[PDB]
Design a protein around this ligand. Sequence first.
Ligand SMILES: [Mn+2]
Length: 582
Amino acid sequence: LIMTTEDESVIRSAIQTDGVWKEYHAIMIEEADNILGKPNCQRVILGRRLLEVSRECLRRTLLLGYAYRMTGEVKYAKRAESELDNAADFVDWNPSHFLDVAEMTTAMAIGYDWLYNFISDQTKLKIEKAIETKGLNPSLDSQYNSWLYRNNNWNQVCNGGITLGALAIYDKIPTLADELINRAVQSVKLPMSVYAPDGAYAEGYSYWGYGTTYNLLLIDALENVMGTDYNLSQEPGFLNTGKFIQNMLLSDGKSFNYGDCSSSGRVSPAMFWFANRTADKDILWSEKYQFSLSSKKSIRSYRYAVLALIWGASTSMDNLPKPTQRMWVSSKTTTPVALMRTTWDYQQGLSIALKGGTAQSGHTHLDAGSFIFISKDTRWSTDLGPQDYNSLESKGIDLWNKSQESDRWKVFRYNNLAHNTLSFDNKYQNVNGYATITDFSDNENYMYAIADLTKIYEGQAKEVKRGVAIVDSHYAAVRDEVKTLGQPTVIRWNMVTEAQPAIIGEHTIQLSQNGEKLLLEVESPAKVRMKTWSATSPNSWDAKNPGVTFVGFEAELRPNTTEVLQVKLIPEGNFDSNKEIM
Ligand SMILES: [Mn+2]
C-alpha cells in the first residue's frame, strides 16, 4: 500500500525550499530517465556472484519507483515493472553468495510496495512467490544462512533484506513473517555490537555505509510496519556512529583513509538518518560539504542515492550552524582513532588524525600509530591507501592472509615502511599487537592524543609511546618515547608526502606544495640522519606512486635507553619556539 520505508506521509520531499534536495531530486529524475533508455539486467554470474545485477536492480527499482511516485509518468512505472518482472523470473538469486539474495529481495520488496497499485496481478503474484521461494525460504536453509551467527556486515545486509521482503508481503505470510522478524531482531544484535561504545567502525569510513544502511532499512521498516524498532536503535554506540563518520572526514574534506579505504568521501544517505534522529545539524554540515564536493556522476552512480532524500528531506540544509566540538575520540574499540581539527571551516585551520589498532581486523595496513596532518588546504602527511585486487592476485595470491609472514604485508602500500609511523631495521610491525589511545585532551591551545604502541613493536622495543599535538592552533608536534632492548637498533621515522622535499639542514626538511612551505623540524634525538626515500617499488606488481616521496630521518638508538624522537611540522606564519614535555 506503500508502507515499508518511504511512507506516504514522508513525501515531504515535495516541499522544495531547500536547494540541496531540489538539485538532488533533479539528479535522480535525470538518472531515472537514463534507465528508461536501457534494457533489463540479464542474469549473469560474475565470479560466482550475482551481486552486481542485484544492486543494479535495487538501484533502478529505487530510481524508477521514486521517480514514478513523485511524477506520475507511467513510463517510470512500466520500466520498473519490467525490471521487477524480469528479475522475479531469474531462476534463483544465487544463494551461494547470499548478499545477492539479500539485495535482490530488497529490490523486490521496495518495488512491490512502491508500485503496488500500478503493477499487475500476474506480477503481484509473481513477486510474492519470488520473494518467498527465492529469498525468504533459502534464508531458512542452514546451507546459506550462516551469516545469522556472524558479526560482520553480511548479518546486517541479509537480515535487512530478508526482513524487508517478509514485511512487504506480510499479509500473505503473517506467521512466517513473524518468525523472521523475531529472528532478525535477535541476530542483528551481533553486528550492531561492533559500534559500541562510541560508534567507531573498525574498517573505517568507506566500509561503513553498506551494513549501516541495511541496519537502518531494517529499523525504519520495523518502525513503519510493527510500530516499534524493538530497541535496536538503542544498542550502545549505534546512535553516535554518525558522529564517527562526521569526524572521519578531516579538514580538507577527505577521509582518514587508513587501510583499504579510499580518501574520497561521498554523500552518505545513512548520515541523514542519524542527523534526523539525534537532532544533529553537525552531521548535516559535513554532509552538505560532501555534496558541495561531489560530482553529478557519483550521486547518480550510488545504489542507495534515493535514501538520502527519504531520510534527509525532513530537514533543511540552509543556514547550518558551525559545529563547535573540535575533537572526537574512541579507545575501547578495534581501531582506536583520535580526530582533531581547530575549526570546522573546511580548508582552514589544522587537523590531525591518529590511529592505533591491530592488523588482525579487516582491511588493515601496518599503520598502528600512523597519523594524518592537514594544514589549510594541504594534506602534508598522507596515506597511500589500497592497491586494488587482482593487480596482485594473479601471481602470488593471499592478499587477505593477516599472519606475520603473509604476502599481504609484502605489498609496498601495506607495510609500515610506507605509512606515517615507525620501523626498526626495516622490519614490519608486529601484526598481532594492539594499540589504543591512552590519553587525549580538547584544550584548544594544545589539542593532543597519545597512543601506546608497545605491543605493535614487541620483539623490537621494550616500550613505544607516541603523542601528536596541535600547538596553539598553528603547528603540529609528534613525540615518540622509545625504550630500547639490548641491541643497537636504527629507528626510521617515516612520513608519506605529496610535497616537494628538500633536506635544508642536519635535522630539518622543508616541504613545498600549493605554493606554500612546511618545516619538518627534528628536535630529538641530538644526532639524526635526514632522509628521503623513493616511493616507487622495486617490484613490478606494486602500483606506481607518482608525486609521492617518503621523508623523515634515521637514528641509531643505544640499547637499554629511553630515547625520544621529536618532530615539529611547522606551517607558514609567526610562532614556534616551544618546549618538549609530554
Ligand atoms: Mn595505508
